[PDB]
């Protein structure tokens, strides 16, 4: 039941020392533990399964069939993730996709449309992401519009925290594996696009592993 | 049927229509 950490990044998570997951993204450190997400956002986070894909391969004694899972995950304010796992059994693949989905959560950037009053609601600019031949574009939208999209990427924008956005999908969107990943790249590039507000010199704070380099050696390996 | 010989069959058939139409005039 009790969590014992493996990666030394997660050691500081258990020592009550990492204040938030934002400075984890600040230094682009890799996350390889699914329960690191569970310490910061273990309550508001929700999961939702996209599709169960029964892929198979041709063997000599019939077709070896295994089940591929598609789970999108993320709390409704600031974060969203996607995970794909292809296991032997459906429930194992669903459970195994949740673990990979928490490892792949990314922070969102929410912007205003025109006027800048209240809370940010829409995508700050026109970002797009693609994999394979599926290309998905995100357009800023006024308040109260809703998510104008296909039903499957509509769940992802519910779970990313964006309430209003216009979308456009180019390509064979019947393939849900590429259709979901192409959208998930587009939200993931919101903090990859340079904004004119972000033209200031970024002050460098102390590294999270640097600030507790003595704390990480006095109690364990 | 190879695509080459069906073209050759068409030319033999087209030439056959050439002689048949010519004798009527």
């Amino acid at each position: 039941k009790e969590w014992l950490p493996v990666t030394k990044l997660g050691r500081l998570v258990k020592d009550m020392k990492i204040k938030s997951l934002e400075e984890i993204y600040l230094f682009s450190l890799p996350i390889k533990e699914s329960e690191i997400i569970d310490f910061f956002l273990g309550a508001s986070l929700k999961d939702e399964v996209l599709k169960i894909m029964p892929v198979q391969k041709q063997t000599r004694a019939g077709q070896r069939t295994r089940f591929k899972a598609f789970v999108a995950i993320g709390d409704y304010n600031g974060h969203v993730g996607l995970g794909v796992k292809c296991s032997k059994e459906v429930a194992t693949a669903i459970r195994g996709a949740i673990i990979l989905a928490k490892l792949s959560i990314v922070p969102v950037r929410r912007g205003y449309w025109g006027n800048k009053i209240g809370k940010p609601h829409t995508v700050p600019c026109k970002v797009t992401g693609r994999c394979g031949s599926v290309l998905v574009r995100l357009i800023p939208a006024p308040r109260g519009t809703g998510i104008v999209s296909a039903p499957v990427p509509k769940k992802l924008l519910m779970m990313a925290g964006i309430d209003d956005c216009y979308t456009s999908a180019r390509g064979c969107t019947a393939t849900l594996g590429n259709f979901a990943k192409a959208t998930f790249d587009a939200i993931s590039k919101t903090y990859s696009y340079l904004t004119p507000d972000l033209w200031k010199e970024t002050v460098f704070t102390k590294s999270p592993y640097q600030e507790f380099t003595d704390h990480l050696v006095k109690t364990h390996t | 049927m190879r695509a080459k010989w069906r073209k050759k069959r068409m030319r033999r058939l087209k030439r056959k229509r050439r002689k048949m139409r010519q004798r009527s005039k």
Partner: protein, 83 residues
């Protein structure tokens, strides 16, 4: 990012590349966080503070990651300006 009434609204500010001036993404696992030790002028010993930099993973894979730090190193005085 600002609202109308003058409050910061983003949950964090991402880093920026020291050479290419691009913002470093959250999943740029090939990012660099350099730490450059300073030297005391008379005793020639370590002081205690940092002169840290930040380089995106694209520059490493393009082969100018040693040159990028080197160019800031002349400008920050770590490397002798004659070189």
């Amino acid at each position: 990012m600002q609202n109308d009434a003058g409050e910061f609204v983003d949950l964090y500010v991402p880093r920026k590349c020291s050479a290419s001036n691009r913002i470093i993404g959250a999943k740029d696992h090939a990012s660099i966080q350099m730490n450059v030790a300073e030297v005391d002028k008379v005793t020639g010993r370590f002081n205690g503070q940092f002169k840290t930099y930040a380089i995106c993973g694209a520059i490493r894979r393009m082969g100018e990651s040693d040159d990028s730090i080197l160019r800031l190193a002349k400008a920050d005085g770590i490397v002798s300006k004659n070189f």
